[PDB]
Amino acid sequence: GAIAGFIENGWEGLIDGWYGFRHQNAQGEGTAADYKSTQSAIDQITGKLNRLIEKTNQQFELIDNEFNEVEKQIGNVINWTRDSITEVWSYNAELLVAMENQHTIDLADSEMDKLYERVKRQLRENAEEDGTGCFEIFHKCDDDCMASIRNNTYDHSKYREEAMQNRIQ
């Protein structure tokens, strides 16, 4: 009946954002999305999308004919050239997409890590990593305290005494 983080699954309930928080305390279990990490990820992906929508100003016209077939030699030269550049663009397209998808996946993994690392630096010496991508908080953290972590207003100074006490015996 525990909760788990990114290190061993995603959240099909996180429907209002890409990245988020899931806590549990005396008030119970809850889930909210983080804006800054989600927006960064979305900004970068849409950035790729715009970069591929940018149309070309090159206009191309007919050099052969599918009603009156051109002379054989010049026709085969044309077809040979067209199929050659078709091979090139097919290669380019395949590689571009494969390359971008590799990057899209990685930069998303980065954002997840940066979020996790941020929270860690917030909690200072008041928490420990449980291995599943979660933090065991060694003091009482009500809904108000949990919200304070999500909006970066958590001051570890307030709970450091109580926390360090519990972490040691």
Partner 1 sequence: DKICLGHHAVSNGTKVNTLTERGVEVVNATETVERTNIPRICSKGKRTVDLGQCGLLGTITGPPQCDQFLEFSADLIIERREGSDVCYPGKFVNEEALRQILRESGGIDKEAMGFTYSGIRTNGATSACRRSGSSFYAEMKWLLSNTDNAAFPQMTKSYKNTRKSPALIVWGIHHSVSTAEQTKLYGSGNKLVTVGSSNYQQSFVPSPGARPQVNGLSGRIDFHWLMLNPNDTVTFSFNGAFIAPDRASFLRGKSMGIQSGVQVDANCEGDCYHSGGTIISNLPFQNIDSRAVGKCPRYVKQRSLLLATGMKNVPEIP
Ligand X SMILES: *[C@@H]1O[C@H](CO)[C@@H](O)[C@H](O)[C@H]1NC(C)=O
By the criterion CB under 8 A, which residues form the site for its own copies?
Answer: 51, 56, 58, 60-61, 63, 73-74, 76-78, 80-81, 83-89, 91-92, 95-96, 98-99, 102-103, 121-122, 124-125, 128-129, 131, 161, 164, 167-169
| One residue of 67, 151, 168, 169 binding partner 1 per CB under 8 A | 67
Contact 166, 137 (CB under 8 A): no
Amino acid, res. 62:
L
* 27-62 per-residue burial string, b: 16 or more CB within 10 A, e: under 16: eeeeeebbeebbebbeebeeeeeeeeeeeeeeeeee
| One residue of 15, 121, 151, 168 binding partner 1 per CB under 8 A | 15
| One residue of 35, 36, 39, 76 binding partner 1 per CB under 8 A | 76
Contact 17, 34 (CB under 8 A): yes
| One residue of 1, 61, 168, 169 binding partner 1 per CB under 8 A | 61
Q: How far apart are the first and last CA of the chain?
A: 25
Interaction of residue 73 with partner 1, rule CB under 8 A: yes
Interaction of residue 30 with ligand X, rule CB under 6 A: no
Least distance between its own copies and beta carbon 22 (Å): 18
Q: How many residues would you count in the chain?
A: 169
